[PDB]
Amino acid sequence: SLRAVRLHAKWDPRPEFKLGPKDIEGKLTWLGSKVWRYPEVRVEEVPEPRIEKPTEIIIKVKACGICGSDVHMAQTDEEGYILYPGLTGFPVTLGHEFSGVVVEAGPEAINRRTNKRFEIGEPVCAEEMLWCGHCRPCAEGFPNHCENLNELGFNVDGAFAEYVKVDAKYAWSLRELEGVYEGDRLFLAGSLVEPTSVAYNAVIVRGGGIRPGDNVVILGGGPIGLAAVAILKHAGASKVILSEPSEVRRNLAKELGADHVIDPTKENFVEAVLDYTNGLGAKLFLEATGVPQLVWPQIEEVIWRARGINATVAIVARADAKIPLTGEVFQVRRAQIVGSQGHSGHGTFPRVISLMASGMDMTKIISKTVSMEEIPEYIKRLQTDKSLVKVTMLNE
Template sequence: MSTKMRAVVLHADWDPKPEFKLGPKDIEGRQTYLGSKVWRNPRVTIEERDVPQAGPGEVVIEVKACGICGSDVHMAQPDEQGYILYPGLTGFPAVLGHEFSGVIVDAGPGAFDKRTNKPFKGGEAVCAEEMLWCGACQPCADGWPNHCERLDELGFNVDGAMAKYIKVPARVVWSLEPLREHYSDEEVFLLGSLVEPTSVAYNAVIERSGWGILGGIRPGDNVVICGGGPIGIAACAILKRQGAAKVILSEPEPSRAELGRKMGADYTINPLQEDFTERVLEITHGYGAALYLEATGLPTIVYPQIEKTIWEQKTLNARVMVVARADAKMPVTGEVLQVRRAQIIGAQGHSGHGTFPRVIESMAAGMNMLPMITKQITLDEVPENLVTLRTDRKECKITVRLDKE
């Protein structure tokens, strides 16, 4: 194995806005939980890096496929003042990429496969969580590792997977072996790169929404998904598989709307050409929806439409699930939430309560997410595609094929 590899690296300048105050978990000059308030002048380069070596409890994975996430785009995208658009945990320079799959090529002592409860030997097809939780803080102890007090994130403040090799703790690695019974090797790795974004959708619409729990959505309920990006499209598949009566996707881009229908949406709405509230109430015969997923990242535009629909619909106890990351504030009318017994709930990431293995098993049982991948590129093409994705919404998921390098 070579000692050097090429990697897509994001650099930016630590230049906090005047109103920014260092938080208790921020590290001066190195990382912050409020990226859009601090990091300026993002620059993406392809450069040589050392191939990582596995230590105790760690594995090195040879990356086969890695998806480009909207977070990658927004970390590399400056606003008019030069600050990055991504509002979350960031620390640069860092190798980008957190939606990936590959093959284990090195395993340190104490690196165990959760599926077999035996040490990794090398050669296993795997994917990994991007949220590196500590397992020792209060949120981790309470079963919420995606809210870890010592959280690190692959591709955000720790080197990610847009490189030939990546080192990760074995505790966040999941076997892709269940997929081999139904898919080819190439499909296994492509699907493996979709486990992370699909798990983000799963966490939002199943775990955080309280599926099957008193007050949560149940089979037979109507759902509305705002935004036909990868998370919204994955939610279409998950919710239809879980028994939602009418899955309604609000998405203005025709290609994404069509993909949503292919993946499970029963109806689509173009909010630029149709009245959102009128159309939702028409489709549902006035009942509206039990769940509204905000997956656009445009809360100032989308939330007022959701709120108006909740006010006018027959169904009480609606939940607005916020999964898209955005710096903007939501214009909330408390009276609507009170009178209609509605809730706004945030969903972050994917870890906890078995999201990864459940998504993998769902894929193995026939939930084929491969149509989400609409374009495949090489490592050298990543920088230009990060720029293209700022404005071009025709593609759903662009995947970097490192096995073709």
């Protein structure tokens, strides 16, 4: 009587593949696209989750967003290999951008909000990055770089399901959203915390944030770029400029508070940015396109010509191609480059929840809510349908 969206695939590695040190033959690899072949995504029966450890909770799922990584796990190259390049342990229940209600909690399952055992009925979201808590990075406070990481919806059953079990240490209360987001809207808001927290980690934690009055430039208007728009407007950016080919995304960015939006295929990016900032340029650039080798010369030209100094370029999207870095630009303009990944640690989750509670409405980016049954359809449709910004499962 229980059902979830699951991905099955054939372990059939490419000839260059050698089993990685943390890979498990036939079951788990750190290099998905080298190994897993002919992915199939279907709704299927699953056994009931059960509390195995005293710190575990079982959440009844209300909403779950489809990530671009979900699309890439289910999509193939010409040879039938998945596009998704990273950690994958199939078969798995997909979905990691979620919220729901706690329906069961082991005796040691603590809610950080109360520092007491999780109570039935608590609305929660959870982290996708399942950090171990004991390794050297975790012990220094850097869980996004855990040496023993697992990933919800990648190799641990996720949340395109009726129920999902996770350790309490990954769950965060949505109680603050109550009476700000009525009914289902609370859970929609909750399901956007993970991708907003990716953006938050990138611009606030790794980026170093801004002083109010600073300008920022975001490249890429997907979910992460869009969350950056809202976050940095809320952080007090005087000008928030987003560069993005897609019109629906540029329009969304305006709803989220972008002061200017650029279509880089029809406008000169460099000139628009300099004009918009009166030659000052920006304190922070967020590279969220995934084509940094293509946008990098433009970013450098702004940094070079701008009168502002101390610019940070935060790289959050994944790409393979090399970046054409001109050392001199960063020397002469007192600028720097940081990489970002993940959404865990640093109190990022709770601050994003508080920020949502205090008015920051990300639910605007949800193009469509759908039933669990329609999720396989939309996962496939997102391979080509550029009009869809964010599709969210909603259990009604």
